[PDB]
Amino acid sequence: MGLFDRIKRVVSSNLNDLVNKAEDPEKMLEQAILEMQEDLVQLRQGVAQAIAAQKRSEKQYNDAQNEINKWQRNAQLALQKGDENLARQALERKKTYTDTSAALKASLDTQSTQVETLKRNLIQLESKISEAKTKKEMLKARITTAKAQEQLQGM
């Protein structure tokens, strides 16, 4: 029991000393400003990759659409050939591709929503840094005023 009490006293004394020593508005703000921007950049990179991925997905989707069109030409060729099997294969392939496209579309919608959510979050995050930047300027302005005020009080 005694040890716990002793630890608390030491911790309390240390904590009181620590807060006063590290309480610099300008130093903390500068560090904070650098950190948020860095975090935002990482998010931006992820967003760019996601956008690229969506574009890549669209290209893949386009290829599937292109394949279906090519297959449609093959079906016409099959009629000239007169072979039942070629026509049957094209129809089966066309059906799975449509199903795949639907799945891809659902994935694309989810991806778009995620990107939109990320973009919305980014805008909110961007606004916060702007507010912080404005606040930092205001905070800095106040500090200059305080220095001026103290001298006036002194004289």
Partner 1 sequence: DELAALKAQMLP
Partner 2 sequence: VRGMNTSSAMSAFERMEEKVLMQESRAQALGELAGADLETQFAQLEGGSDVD
Residues that bind its own copies (CB under 8 A): 1-2, 5-6, 8-16, 18-19, 21-22, 24, 26-28, 30-31, 34, 53-54, 56-57, 60, 96, 100, 103-104, 127, 131, 134, 137-138, 140-141, 144
The distance of closest approach from Cβ of residue 57 to partner 1 in the complex, given in angstroms and rounded to an integer, is: 27
The distance of closest approach from Cβ of residue 80 to its own copies in the complex, given in angstroms and rounded to an integer, is: 25
- 134 vs 125: CA distance, rounded Å: 14
Is 150 near partner 2 (CB under 8 A)? yes
- Binding pattern to partner 2, positions 57-96, x when CB under 8 A? --x----------xx--x--xx-xx-x-xx--xx--x---
Contact 74, 94 (CB under 8 A): no
Question: Which residue matches tokens 């302005």?
Answer: 141
Q: Which two tokens stand for residue 71?
A: 């297959």
Among the listed residues 54, 52, 44, the one whose alpha carbon sits nearest the alpha carbon of residue 110: 54
Is 149 near partner 2 (CB under 8 A)? yes
Which amino acid, residue 4?
Answer: F
- 22 vs 87: CA distance, rounded Å: 78
Among the listed residues 123, 126, 127, 119, the one whose alpha carbon sits nearest the alpha carbon of residue 50: 119
> In the complex, which residues of this chain contact partner 1 (CB under 8 A)?
75-76, 78-80, 82, 84, 87-88, 90-92, 95
